[PDB]
Amino acid sequence: NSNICEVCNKWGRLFCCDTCPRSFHEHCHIPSVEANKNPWSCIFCRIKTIQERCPESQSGHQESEVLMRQMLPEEQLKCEFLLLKVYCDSKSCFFASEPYYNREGSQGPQKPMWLNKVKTSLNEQMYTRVEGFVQDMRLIFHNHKEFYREDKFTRLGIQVQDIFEKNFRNIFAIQETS
Ligand SMILES: [Zn+2]
Ligand SMILES: [Zn+2]
Ligand SMILES: [Zn+2]
Structure with a gap:
């Protein structure tokens, strides 16, 4: 080992x-x-x-069909593995724990979200479809982009979302496109 x-x-x-x-x-x-x-x-x-x-x-699969799948054991596992692939990148640290928002010229998101919250939700079987998990994961990065505005720190959200999306396409065998 x-x-x-x-x-x-x-x-x-x-x-x-x-x-x-x-x-x-x-x-x-x-x-x-x-x-x-x-x-x-x-x-x-x-x-x-x-x-x-x-x-x-x-x-190859269509993303729309994958999102509508119920969270049976194999889809549960696939979401757990996708979550783990995001934690594998060191830049996941910025998104792991509960955020707070106090920056001049910005207002916090309406629905905060973070990786350990998604991890608890998976563990508690709170998602009934793949869509629920994917929406919370994309919400993490979207909240970050909106809040950080023109600060170059916005880029951290783009980077970790790219890790998420590449792994999503791999794990759920999304049909390759140009
Ligand atoms: Zn092994
Ligand atoms: Zn078969
Ligand atoms: Zn470890």
């Missing part, structure tokens, strides 16, 4: 995958690394199994 957390790239108390060489902090993995289960397989491994069981699942 690797000697660093796959998500945050630090050492520490790490749980090792049985079917691949990745390792995780307990609360860096999503879902949080399970109490027992020997062997244990990481989310990366579980996602790869879905693809291997149903190779046609990699054929």
Whole structure:
């Protein structure tokens, strides 16, 4: 196994995958690394199994159909993995915890949102369709762009949204376009 957390790239108390060489902090993995289960397989491994069981699942899909899917176990997992792919980027730190808004010339968003809130909502099974999860994730970046206006810090929202969108298209096999 690797000697660093796959998500945050630090050492520490790490749980090792049985079917691949990745390792995780307990609360860096999503879902949080399970109490027992020997062997244990990481989310990366579980996602790869879905693809291997149903190779046609990699054929192109329309985003509108994906969003309307109900959050059955495989879609739950896919959203957990997409969330984890965002935490994998170090720039996710800016969006992880609850924000506050006090900048001259700007007003805070009407509906604040942040990654740990989306993480709790997934854990609590609060999303009934893929659309709910995707709307909250895009809302994080949209709130940031609106609030920061012409400050160059706006760019952090563009950067982390690009990580989200590339991973969304990969994980849910969105049909490639020009
Ligand atoms: Zn970690
Ligand atoms: Zn694994
Ligand atoms: Zn199949």
